[PDB]
C-alpha cells in the first residue's frame, strides 16, 4: 500500500517463477493519470522514477562512466529522458544518446538516424532505451515477438555492454522481444519495473543489473512476458507522483568503481562474484568514438 | 556581411505579442540549491526553477549556428536557473538577460556585486 510513495513497482520474484500463457493486457487503472506537479512533462517525471528506483539496485559506477540512451528524441524537437539522466548521473559521465528523428539534446554527442546505423568502438556501463513505436499497440493483430531495434539492441547488449554493467530498455505489452527476456538471464538479477507515474500503461523498463555476459539463468522469453502480463492483469497499481516532491537523494553516487580490462580466460568465480555484486566494470578504458553509417544515393537522372 | 539576426526577430516576435518558445524541459529538484544562473546540475532555489539548457538555448531550439565564432553553447549541457515569474518563456529570459561573470548569478535577479 505503501507502494505510492514509491518511484514504482518491480516485478515480484514469485512472478517470475510461473509458466503462464499470453493473454490480452487489461489495465484496471488504464486511463486513470497521476498529477503531475505543475508544468512538468510525463517524461521528466517517468525518467525521474526510472533513475529512482535505479538508485535501490547495485549499480557499477565508475569514473568516466559511459552512457548511451536510444529513443531519446520526442515529438517535441527535444530529450527530456536525456535532461534527466544527465542530472542523475556524476558530473562528466560521458552521455550519448540518439534517435531516428532530429531533436536538440544536453547529451555529449547525438546521432540521428535509425539505431541499426548506429555503431561505437568502445564499451558502454549502462544502456537506456525509449524506443518504441505506436504501432505495436494494434490490439487486432496477434501480439508475437517483435523484431526491429529490439534484435539491434540484444546484439549491441552482447557486443558492446562492459562485464558488470546495466540496461533499462523500455518495453510495452506489444512491444516486446523473447531474446532480450533470455538476454536478462545473463546478469545478476533482473527485473520488469513500472513507473507510478505511468502505471496505467503496460510499459514497463526491462533492468538487467550487472551484466555477467553468460547464462546466469536459463529464461524463456515468450513465457516471462506472459508472466509480465499476468502480473500486470492481476495487480493493480496506483497511479502516484509522490515520489517526485523529493529529490534530495536522487543524485546517483559516484562509487568509484574499478575498471579493469581482462580476458575471458581470466573471469572467474572471484570477478564473476564481484561483477555480480557491482562493484567491478570490465572494458577498455580507451577514449570513446562513435559514428553514425550514412546511406549515399544521387536521385539525378 | 549578411547573417541573420535569430536574437533581434526572438525579441520582435515576443513584442509583437507572439507565443513565448515552449517545451523547454523543466527539471524535478529540490529548490534548495544555490540560485546560480547556469550550472552543471539543476541549482534552482526557491524562487526559481530549473531546466534542461538546450531546450532554453535559442540557437539550438531554432537549428542555427551559435554568436560564438567557435559555435560553442552557453547552455548545452547544463542547467539554466530561471525566476519563477519568467519561467513562461526562459529562451526569452536566456536570451535578453546577462550572467554576472564574478558571482555567478543572473545580473538583476541575484546578484548582488553592485550593492555593497
Ligand atoms: N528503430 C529506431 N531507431 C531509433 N529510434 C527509434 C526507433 N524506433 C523508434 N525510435 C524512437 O523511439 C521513440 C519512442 O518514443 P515514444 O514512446 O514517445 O513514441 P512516439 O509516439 O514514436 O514518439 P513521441 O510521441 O515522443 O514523438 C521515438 O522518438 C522514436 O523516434
Ligand atoms: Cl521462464
Ligand atoms: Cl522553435
Ligand atoms: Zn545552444
Ligand atoms: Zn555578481
Redesign the pocket.
Given at each position: 500500500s505503501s507502494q505510492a510513495w514509491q518511484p514504482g513497482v518491480a516485478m515480484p520474484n514469485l512472478y517470475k517463477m510461473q509458466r503462464m500463457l499470453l493473454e490480452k493486457c487489461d489495465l484496471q487503472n488504464y486511463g486513470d493519470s497521476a498529477t503531475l506537479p505543475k508544468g512538468i512533462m510525463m517524461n521528466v517525471a517517468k525518467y525521474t522514477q526510472l533513475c529512482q528506483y535505479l538508485n535501490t539496485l547495485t549499480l557499477a559506477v565508475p569514473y568516466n562512466m559511459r552512457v548511451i540512451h536510444?529513443?531519446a528524441?520526442?515529438?517535441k524537437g527535444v530529450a527530456p529522458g536525456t535532461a534527466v539522466l544527465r542530472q542523475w548521473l556524476p558530473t562528466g559521465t560521458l552521455l550519448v544518446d540518439?534517435?531516428?528523428?532530429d531533436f536538440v539534446s544536453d547529451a555529449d554527442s547525438t546521432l540521428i538516424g535509425?539505431?541499426?546505423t548506429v555503431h561505437t568502438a568502445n564499451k558502454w556501463d549502462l544502456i537506456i532505451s525509449?524506443?518504441?513505436?505506436?504501432k505495436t499497440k494494434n490490439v487486432t493483430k496477434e501480439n508475437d515477438s517483435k523484431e526491429?531495434?529490439f534484435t539491434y539492441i540484444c546484439g549491441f547488449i552482447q557486443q558492446k555492454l562492459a562485464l558488470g554493467g546495466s540496461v533499462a530498455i523500455k518495453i510495452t505489452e506489444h512491444s516486446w522481444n523473447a531474446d532480450l527476456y533470455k538476454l536478462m538471464g545473463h546478469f545478476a538479477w533482473w527485473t520488469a519495473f513500472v513507473t507510478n507515474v505511468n502505471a496505467s500503461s503496460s510499459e514497463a523498463f526491462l533492468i538487467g543489473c550487472n551484466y555477467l555476459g553468460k547464462p546466469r539463468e536459463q529464461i524463456d522469453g515468450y513465457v516471462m512476458h506472459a508472466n509480465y502480463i499476468f502480473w500486470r492483469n492481476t495487480n493493480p497499481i496506483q497511479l502516484s507522483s509522490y515520489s517526485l516532491f523529493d529529490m534530495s537523494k536522487f543524485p546517483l553516487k559516484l562509487r568509484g568503481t574499478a575498471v579493469m580490462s581482462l580476458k575471458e580466460g581470466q573471469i572467474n568465480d572471484m570477478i564473476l562474484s564481484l561483477l555480480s555484486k557491482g562493484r567491478l566494470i570490465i572494458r577498455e578504458n580507451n577514449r570513446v568514438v562513435i559514428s553514425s553509417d550514412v546511406l549515399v544515393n544521387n536521385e539525378n537522372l | 556581411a549578411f547573417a541573420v539576426d535569430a536574437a533581434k526577430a526572438y525579441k520582435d516576435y515576443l513584442a509583437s505579442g507572439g507565443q513565448p518558445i515552449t517545451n523547454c524541459v523543466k527539471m524535478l529538484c529540490t529548490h534548495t540549491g544555490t540560485g546560480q544562473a547556469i550550472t552543471v546540475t539543476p541549482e534552482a532555489n526557491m524562487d526559481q526553477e530549473s531546466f534542461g539548457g538546450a531546450s532554453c538555448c535559442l540557437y539550438c531550439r531554432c537549428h542555427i549556428d551559435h554568436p560564438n565564432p567557435k559555435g560553442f553553447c552557453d547552455l548545452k549541457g547544463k542547467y539554466v536557473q530561471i525566476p519563477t515569474t519568467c519561467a513562461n518563456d526562459p529562451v526569452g529570459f536566456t536570451l535578453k538577460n546577462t550572467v554576472c561573470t564574478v558571482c555567478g548569478m543572473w545580473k538583476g535577479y541575484g546578484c548582488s556585486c553592485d550593492q555593497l
Open positions: 536510444f529513443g528524441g520526442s515529438d540518439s534517435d531516428l528523428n535509425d539505431c541499426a525509449d524506443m518504441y513505436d505506436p526491429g531495434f | -
